[PDB]
């Protein structure tokens, strides 16, 4: 797989090459290829780094290994009647996933905790992080970090179209609507 990368990068340098490595010491060889550029999204998905990392965070907070593992497998909620009370609540948790989408102009000049509250209370979307314009990736910052225009927000939600309610939100129009499916309106 290291040689597969070299052959691609030999043919053409400017290209995104994502690799699945197994051992962590082999990741050092990919980083020393001259064409391999971190900046343009060449991600060496090292399994041993992540595998043990997921486990390591469970030592700090048990069960976190399977909180995160479910966020990246793209699932959908199909509650069969054979399941019990505890399983149906778990299988809803499997259907949640990470998503990136831009916040609307309603969130501009507004603090993080108040913004994350509006996403949860009204829109029903858990807002984790906001990328701030070197684009720094700030996870759950305090009240000091404000929201600039066209900020990329990181959401835990059921689907991507559910997160698109953040993009179509309006303080003038949608502020009195209880049904959250009624926020499909791009017209604000």
């Amino acid at each position: 797989n290291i040689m597969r990368v070299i052959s691609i990068k030999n043919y053409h340098s400017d290209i995104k090459v994502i690799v699945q490595l197994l051992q962590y010491h082999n990741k050092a060889y990919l980083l020393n290829i001259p064409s391999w550029d971190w900046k343009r999204g060449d991600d060496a998905v090292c399994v041993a780094e992540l595998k043990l990392g997921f486990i390591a965070q469970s030592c700090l907070a048990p069960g976190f290994s399977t909180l995160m593992a479910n966020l990246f497998t793209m699932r959908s909620y199909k509650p069969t009647p054979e399941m019990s009370q505890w399983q149906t609540d778990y299988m809803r948790g499997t259907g949640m996933e990470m998503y990136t989408e831009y916040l609307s102009s309603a969130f501009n000049a507004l603090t993080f905790p108040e913004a994350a509250e509006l996403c949860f209370s009204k829109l029903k979307l858990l807002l984790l992080a906001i990328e701030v314009r070197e684009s720094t990736l700030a996870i759950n910052p305090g009240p000091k970090v404000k929201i600039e225009n066209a900020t990329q927000g990181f959401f835990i939600a059921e689907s991507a179209e559910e997160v698109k309610r953040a993009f179509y939100y309006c303080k003038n129009c949608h502020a009195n609507v209880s049904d959250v499916r009624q926020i499909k309106k791009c017209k604000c």
């Binding site: 992540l50 595998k51 069960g63 399977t66 909180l67 479910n70 994350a116 759950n140 835990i156």
Partner: protein
């Protein structure tokens, strides 16, 4: 204190997850994620990270999100230092560098003691999330609820439940902290 020892087992095979726990319904047809040992954080197969190749394409930043959240700040700065071959290095460092201790780690908050215990008795998850966010600077991701409530000490994950979801005094809540 015998079965109450918390442990997590790495596995080569997904089908071998059934042999770990002694009290559940087992089918090799059922996938690894639906099984009782995985749901409770007792197992972790490698197969669940096959989907991570797709997310790295679509969401370039979603992969680098979790590497901050998991490894505890594995910056590219480190990866190039380690590629140079002399291992880890540092010293005492300046106060500008040591101001980078503030980032959000993950943590559990039991709803037995403390100010949040009031919500565990009667109230819902939505009421907890709003109160915790304003005062403390906390995002409640999910719950780690007991399987049996009517007794083994096996708790299962519930990632981002609904607004109106009832809590118990025995629950534990996953949280991103600033402490």
């Amino acid at each position: 204190a015998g079965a109450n020892v918390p442990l997590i087992t790495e596995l080569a095979n997904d089908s071998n997850v059934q042999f770990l726990d002694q009290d559940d319904d087992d089918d090799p047809d059922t996938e690894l994620y639906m099984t009782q040992p995985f749901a409770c954080g007792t197992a972790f197969a490698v197969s669940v990270l096959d989907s991570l190749m797709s997310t790295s394409y679509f969401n370039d930043n979603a992969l680098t999100l979790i590497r901050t959240l998991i490894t505890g700040g594995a910056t590219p700065e480190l990866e190039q230092i380690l590629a140079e071959g002399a291992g880890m290095r540092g010293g005492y460092c300046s106060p500008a560098v040591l101001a980078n201790r503030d980032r959000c780690r993950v943590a559990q908050i039991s709803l037995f003691d403390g100010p949040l215990a009031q919500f565990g008795q009667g109230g819902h998850y939505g009421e907890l999330f709003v109160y915790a966010l304003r005062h403390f600077g906390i995002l409640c991701i999910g719950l780690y609820r007991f399987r049996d409530t009517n007794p083994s000490s096996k708790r299962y994950v519930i990632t981002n439940p609904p607004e109106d979801f009832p809590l118990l005094p025995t629950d534990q809540v996953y949280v991103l902290t600033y402490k």
